[PDB]
Amino acid sequence: HHHHHRSGGLVPRGSHMENLYFQGDAPTVNDVTSDATQVTGQAEPNSTVKLTFPDGTTATGTADDQGNYTIDIPSNVDLNGGEELQVTATDKDGNTSESTNTTII
């Protein structure tokens, strides 16, 4: 009478997406000139902003709900003339902004 026609089913293959980590700019420092007992500035909101003194003392902190940070200078390190203060804000996923290493002193 006639022939038979059947259809064909197959499984979809697994894939993945890709992305660049941090895309923006480096966290702004305020002029923390030696006698200034606190390092302040603007950074990524609620991001773990690691304060890296060029002495090597790293005072780990986190920026506020607002896009700023306040991390007081610990009584051991001094910002003497020649210190290039490095600040590094790190997003909650782990996307660190550029290291603002700047001689305020």
Side-chain angles (χ1 to χ4, degrees):
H1 52 276
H2 283 116
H3 295 246
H4 297 134
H5 180 269
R6 59 283 170 190
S7 188
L10 66 168
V11 299
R13 63 182 62 172
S15 60
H16 73 106
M17 295 305 300
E18 58 187 86
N19 59 271
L20 207 292
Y21 300 94
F22 182 79
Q23 293 181 90
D25 67 284
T28 308
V29 195
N30 294 330
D31 59 292
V32 50
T33 51
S34 58
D35 185 81
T37 56
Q38 299 174 211
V39 183
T40 56
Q42 287 181 28
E44 304 177 74
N46 302 95
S47 297
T48 303
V49 57
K50 178 175 297 183
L51 218 302
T52 305
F53 295 88
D55 173 81
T57 301
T58 56
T60 60
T62 296
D64 182 56
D65 175 77
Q66 187 180 330
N68 75 94
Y69 64 95
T70 304
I71 303 175
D72 59 279
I73 298 175
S75 185
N76 68 274
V77 63
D78 181 75
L79 291 182
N80 197 330
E83 297 298 89
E84 58 281 87
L85 188 64
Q86 181 181 91
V87 309
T88 44
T90 303
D91 173 69
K92 291 103 284 181
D93 180 69
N95 306 273
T96 309
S97 46
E98 294 72 67
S99 56
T100 309
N101 56 326
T102 45
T103 49
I104 312 298
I105 47 284

